[PDB]
Amino acid sequence: QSISPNAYQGLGVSGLTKLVTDGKKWTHTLLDDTVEPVLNGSVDANGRPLFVESTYESLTTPFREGRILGRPTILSDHVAEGDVVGYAGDFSQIIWGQVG
Amino acid sequence: FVESTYESLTTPFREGRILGRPTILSDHVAEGDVVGYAGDFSQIIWGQVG
DSSP states (O other), X not given: OOOSSOHHIIIIIIIHXXXXXXXXXXXXXXXXXXXXXXXXXXXXXXXXXXXXXXXXXXXXXXXXXXXXXXXXXXXXXSOOBTTBOEEEEOGGGOOOOOOO | OOOTTSOSOOTTGGGOEETTEXXXXXXXXXXXXXXXXXXXXXXXXXXXXX
């Protein structure tokens, strides 16, 4: 899923549609630090930001590790590679373990 | 259907109302082109023997 023009249409609408069409849930989103410009730059038709309020003193609330539409946001400096900048999905489908 | 920074879940979800009418949610009511039903569910009755 492309997210550059507007991240709300990206995650909440077009991205979610691809999961629920297969009966799969959206449980978290995991984003690279390089996503910040497009998430500050996602604006309504008047040019106000979506994810931050008032006089723009605080970070956008996903970058405070706040939720988007109830799903927690997870941030990292090393998840991007190639054209991929993050993952949205059902992170309950992953298990790991360390021996000793 | 959602406000401010969009961090909360959308209001008919969480089983809120729309225009006063309660919203009921399910994972398995869609079939073919149909995605839901709006009406008065007072017109439906059921029973079970034993």
